[PDB]
Symmetry: C2
Subunit: 80 residues, 2 copies
């Protein structure tokens, strides 16, 4: 289904070798950063105002990624 | 005591108002980001290879910032 979100988020997967490269093609994404804490994690921070939309949904991203394990999760703060 | 770290980290305070400003001041700091989840939280990402260091310790950051409630805390990842 179609995926959307105004909030930054994370990419968690066992194969992150194409994450950065794939995310560059989305003009709504501002930057991307691998976690110092866990290799299977990447933070995706969005351009202001932008709304990340992915028509083909998560499977579409998995497909672009070349990783079926990939998962999109919210960012976590130790205060909530 | 001196404060040092090579890893990204969070800033957490009640008066977030000069955080971004103060952070730009450090050439070891690459970017800063307020959390969508919590108004008191800012992410601090460091330039690659860089070491963020505060000789006056965290207290020196509380000074610069004007926020005695400021705390530096590690980043948390899902598991």
């Amino acid at each position: 289904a179609t995926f959307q979100t105004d909030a930054d988020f994370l990419l968690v997967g066992d194969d992150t070798s194409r994450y950065e490269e794939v995310m560059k093609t989305f003009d709504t994404v501002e930057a991307v950063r691998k976690s110092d804490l866990d290799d299977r994690v990447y933070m995706v921070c969005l351009k202001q105002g932008s709304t990340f939309v992915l028509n083909g949904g998560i499977e579409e991203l998995r497909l672009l990624t070349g990783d079926s394990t990939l998962e999109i999760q919210p960012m976590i703060v130790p205060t909530t």
